[PDB]
Amino acid sequence: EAPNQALLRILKETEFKKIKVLGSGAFGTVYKGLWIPEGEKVKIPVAIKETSPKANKEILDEAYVMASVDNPHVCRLLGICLTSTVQLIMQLMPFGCLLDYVREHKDNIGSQYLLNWCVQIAKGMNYLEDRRLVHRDLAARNVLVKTPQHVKITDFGRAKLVPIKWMALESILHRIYTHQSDVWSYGVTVWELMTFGSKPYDGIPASEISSILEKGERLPQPPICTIDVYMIMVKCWMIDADSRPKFRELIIEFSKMARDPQRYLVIQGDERMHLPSPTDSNFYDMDDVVDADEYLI
C-alpha cells in the first residue's frame, strides 16, 4: 500500500476566534469561527467541532481520514487544536446540511439545483472510491452546502478502507461495507433530495427494514421524479451489489440529465425560482476574509 503523506496541521488556540455555537448534540458542540493564521493578513471562516481517552481516539480517527482527502466535493480538515478537549477545525459551510436546506427552501429549489447536487455527490463519492475509502454513513444530513451551487460530502468517523435506513441489505445482515454499499446510501440520499427532505421509511422501525428490503420493497417514486430518475434510484437498491451503478456512471447519468433538467424533474414553477448566488447583494468586520478553498499552503 501507498504511504499516506498527508500533513496534519496543529493550530494554536490563539490563532482562531469562536464567534458563536451552530449546534449541540451527542458528541459535544459545533461552533462558527474565524481562523487568523500567523501574520498572514487572512481571516478564514471556520467550523470548530468539539475529556475521556475513548472519545479522543474517535475524534482523532476522523481527523486522520479528513486530513487525507482533497477534492472540491469532499470536506478536508484544516487542522486540529490540541486543547484539553481536542477539536477539529474545518471550512465553514455557511448554508448548513443539504437535508435541512431542501426542507427550508423547497419553494425555490429547481430541477437544475437537484440534478447538479446529484452530480456533485457522485463526484465526491467517486473520489473517495479512487482513494479506496468507504464512507459507511452517506446521507443528505452528511452533505454540506458551501453555496446553493456547491455541496460537499462530510462526516467521516465511520469511514474505513448504525444508519439502518441508508444501508445496503448486506450491511444490515452481514456488516459488509463496500463502495457498492455506499451506492445504496447514494440512492437514499437522492431520494431525500427529490422528496425535499422526507424521512425514509417513515414510521417503520429499523428492525423491520431488513425484512422489508428482503421482500422486494423499496422507497417510493417521488412525485417530481420521472421514471428516468427513479430508475437510477432503484438500480442503487439491487440485491446484487455489482448490479448497482458505479459512481463514475452516476456522474455521467446525472450530467446528461442536468443538461435538460425539466425533461427529468417536473417541478411546479421551475426556472422562475432563484437561490442566493455569490453575485448577489450582501451574500457575504469582513475585510481580509478568504474562503478555505482559496487558502492554500
Ligand SMILES: COC1CCN(c2nccc(Nc3cc4nc(-c5cn[nH]c5)[nH]c4cn3)n2)CC1
Ligand atoms: C447539531 O447540528 C448542527 C451542526 C452544525 N450546523 C451548521 N450550521 C451552519 C453551518 C455549519 N457549517 C459546518 C458544519 C460542519 N460539520 C462538519 C462535520 C461534523 N461532523 N463531521 C464533519 N463539518 C462542517 C463544516 N461546516 N454547520 C448547525 C446544526
